Design a protein around this ligand. Structure first.
Ligand SMILES: [C-]#N
Ligand code: NA
Ligand code: NA
Ligand code: NA
Ligand code: NA
Ligand code: NA
Length: 320
C-alpha cells in the first residue's frame, strides 16, 4: 500500500504540498505533485480521496479539486469554481458532493465529466459565515457537520439532493465518522477567545444515525481545541485530537484516563488509522511554520517510524 499526506501549508501563502510515504520501505517523497507535474497545488490542500485509481485532492483556497493518477501523480483532470472546497464524498461514479466554507451551498459535481452539476442550499446559512465540512453516508442519507461559525449536523436526502433534517449541538463540530453500530461521532472545537460566534467547553458526541439523536456527550475543558475524530478499519475504536491523541472503544461510557500519545508542546494536527493493520499516523504541525512531521505508531503506541513532510500536514489518504 501507500500513504498520501496532504500539507495545508500556511493559509494565503500558497505553499501547500503533497507527500507520499511507502510503509514497506519507510521512505517519504515530498513535493510529489510538483515533482510529477512541474506546478504547485496551491493554497490549503485540505483533503484527499481515492476512487477507482484516481486521487481527488481538495485545494481549499485555490477553488479547485485536482484528479491525479495515483501511480504517476500526474494531473488527469480538475474541477474549478468552488467557493472554498473542504471534502468530497462520492455517491456514484457520476455524482459527488463538495462541501465548502464561506458558502451556504454544497456543490454537486460529476467526477466523470469534471463538472459542477448542482447545488444543495443549507437552511439558515449565508455566504458570510457558511460552513459544511465532513460527510458520512447512512443508506440514502448523507450527514454533514457544519463547522465554522455553525453548530449543526445536517441530514441530506441524496435522491433529491435536499437537506431534510438538522440537529443542533455545541458550537463548531469539526469532523464526522460512523462507527460499526451506525452511531455517528463528532467532536466540537469550542470556538476561540474573541470569536463573534462563541467560546465554550467543547464536547464529543455519539449520535444515532437511525433516529438522528444524541446518545452520549462527553464535555471537555474550556480552552481545549479538539478535532479529528477518526476510526480504525473495523470502526470500533475512536481516535481524536485534544492536545494528546486519545482513543476509546466506541462502546465506552467513560473517556480514557491515558492518551494514545501524550502532548509534547507541539501541534498534533492530522490523524489516520491504517484500515488493514491498525497502525496510527499522527501529523504534527510543530508550530505551524517549520516542516511538519508524521509519526507512525503500532496499535500499542510503539513508534515504528517518523518522517518529515510539508508544512501543516492536515490529512491522509490510503492507497490500498
Ligand atoms: C482555525 N482552524
Ligand atoms: Na498554503
Ligand atoms: Na477561501
Ligand atoms: Na451562516
Ligand atoms: Na467548512
Ligand atoms: Na476552543
Amino acid at each position: 500500500s501507500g500513504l498520501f499526506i496532504t500539507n495545508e501549508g500556511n493559509f494565503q501563502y500558497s505553499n501547500a504540498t503533497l507527500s507520499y510515504y511507502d510503509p514497506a520501505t519507510c521512505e517519504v517523497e515530498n513535493e510529489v505533485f510538483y515533482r510529477a507535474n512541474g506546478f504547485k497545488l496551491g493554497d490549503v490542500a485540505q483533503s484527499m480521496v481515492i476512487r477507482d485509481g484516481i486521487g481527488w485532492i481538495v485545494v481549499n483556497n485555490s477553488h479547485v479539486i485536482f484528479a491525479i493518477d495515483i501511480n504517476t501523480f500526474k494531473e488527469v483532470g480538475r474541477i474549478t469554481g468552488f467557493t472554498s472546497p473542504r471534502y468530497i464524498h462520492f455517491l456514484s461514479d457520476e455524482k459527488a458532493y463538495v462541501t465548502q466554507i464561506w458558502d451556504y451551498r454544497i456543490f454537486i459535481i460529476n467526477p466523470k465529466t469534471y463538472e459542477i452539476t448542482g447545488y444543495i442550499e443549507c437552511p439558515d446559512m449565508d455566504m458570510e459565515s457558511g460552513s459544511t465540512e465532513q460527510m458520512v453516508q447512512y443508506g440514502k442519507y448523507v450527514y454533514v457537520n457544519c463547522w465554522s461559525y455553525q453548530n449543526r449536523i445536517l441530514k441530506i436526502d441524496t435522491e433529491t439532493d435536499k437537506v431534510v433534517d438538522e440537529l443542533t449541538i455545541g458550537i463548531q463540530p469539526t469532523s464526522l465518522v460512523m462507527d460499526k453500530y451506525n452511531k455517528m461521532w463528532t467532536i466540537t472545537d469550542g470556538g476561540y477567545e474573541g470569536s463573534p460566534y462563541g467560546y465554550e467547553a467543547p464536547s464529543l458526541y455519539r449520535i444515532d444515525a437511525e433516529t438522528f439523536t444524541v446518545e452520549k456527550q462527553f464535555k471537555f475543558k474550556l480552552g481545549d481545541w479538539p478535532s479529528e475524530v477518526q476510526l480504525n478499519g473495523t470502526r470500533d475504536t475512536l481516535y481524536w485530537i485534544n492536545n494528546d491523541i486519545w482513543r476509546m472503544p466506541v462502546e465506552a461510557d467513560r473517556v480514557p484516563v491515558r492518551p494514545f500519545l501524550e502532548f509534547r508542546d507541539t501541534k498534533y494536527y492530522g490523524l489516520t488509522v491504517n484500515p488493514n493493520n491498525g497502525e496510527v499516523y499522527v501529523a504534527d504541525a510543530i508550530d505551524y511554520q517549520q516542516q511538519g512531521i508524521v509519526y507512525r505508531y503500532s496499535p500499542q503506541g510503539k513508534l515504528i517510524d517518523e518522517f518529515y513532510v510539508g508544512i501543516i500536514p492536515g490529512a491522509f489518504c490510503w492507497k490500498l
